[PDB]
Amino acid sequence: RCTKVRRIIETGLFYAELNELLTRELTKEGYGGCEVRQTPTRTEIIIKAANTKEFVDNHGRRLQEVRMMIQKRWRLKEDSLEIFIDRIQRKGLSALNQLESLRYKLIARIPARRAAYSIIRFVMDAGARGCEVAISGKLRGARASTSKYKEGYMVKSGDVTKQFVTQAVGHIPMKQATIGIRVLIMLAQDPSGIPKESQPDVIKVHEA
Template sequence: MDQIPLVKSFIEQGIKLMQINEYLRSELVRAGFAGVDVQKTPLGVRITLRTSRPGLVIGKGGKRIQEITDVLQERFDLEMPQIEVEEVKDPDLNAQIMAERLAYSLDRGRHYRRAGYYILRKIMESGGALGAELRISGKVTSQRSRTQVFRAGTMTKSGQTAQDGVDKGVAQCIQKSGVLGIVVKIQHIDTKMGDEVYLKKDLLLKAQAEAEAQIAKTKAEYALEQEETGLSEEDKQIIDEVDEEAISEISLVPEVEGENEEKGEE
């Protein structure tokens, strides 16, 4: 019997967190809202907002953030909420921010294909993405629902790499024809892949130096042998083919006497 209130409390906490997320997303559309973390502390509730433009969240003299704090305390019954604003260093590599930008572009009437390719090119040109995937589902161009996918680079679909190395963002865009669902996935360039091969550069440089030294040594020995012999390979082959006995039998004296006798007869 004690498990029923516990399960119900978890469900209520999940619903409240979803409602807080939806409220902040609607209020901070232009501020580049990237998500919210809610933590209970002894002094109250700590709310951490992740955004690409903290100045729009804080407002002039902290007026905007004070209004958000009052609404969270009254509407969602949070005890002494303390809001902290965290700036996202690289918004182009945050999937939630890019999903919100795509939804905002579609809400402004931009063509879905042009908006999708613009966001995809923005992600890949940032230099920190290994791959990206965008999905737009709903009544995009006609009364029939379909899904349009935009891909670039490499994207892991399963395994531990897909859970740890892929950032996912979800957004919605309400139009006259219906609601469009948007999903953006970004795989960062520093993701450790299971099939990658890493080379030990120090050992590789050492092996290359030894190979180059061996080649230089071989060239020096060959040049020294050529200087000592002074003969080419063709000359050596001709000398080897000549028989020493045939050389000893050759005599030029009889040939000279024969020539003198022929001259006397004339």
């Protein structure tokens, strides 16, 4: 029994706590966001990740570690909570997933050239119009210094940034200093795929 204001804000505040939680559990499984369906008595949540097998191994024990962690937190009733999972088609173009691949490497002491041009090639071959990778902080010297590695083309301004550009910021702690990882990935519009409409820059004239 809430106001029309608070049912939006509670559901917003639910989602943001829930999403910061499933950063820290599902680092190995390869997290790629979620969606929450809210009902007065029923809650349905789609988790999305790359390694869908890694849940279902040990006859689905890994999901029931998560499902109790949600249930006990907000004190929801079982049956009234209804988690699924659904797989990521094209892991190449999701930003949170490809951040984790660049995180995986730079712990294990690959050069930053080779770590970026691993993923920046993997993004473009999978299917995307451009991508940028930044590795900010302290390699080699006492001063910190910024790498930026770019290909394709990458739109930075307007509304059209928000629709097209996926992006994901993070950080790696180390023995020496705190690096920052940062991967922007631009998409192509599909004809009603999974954006719909083209950019407001482009127009197309018909053939006679």
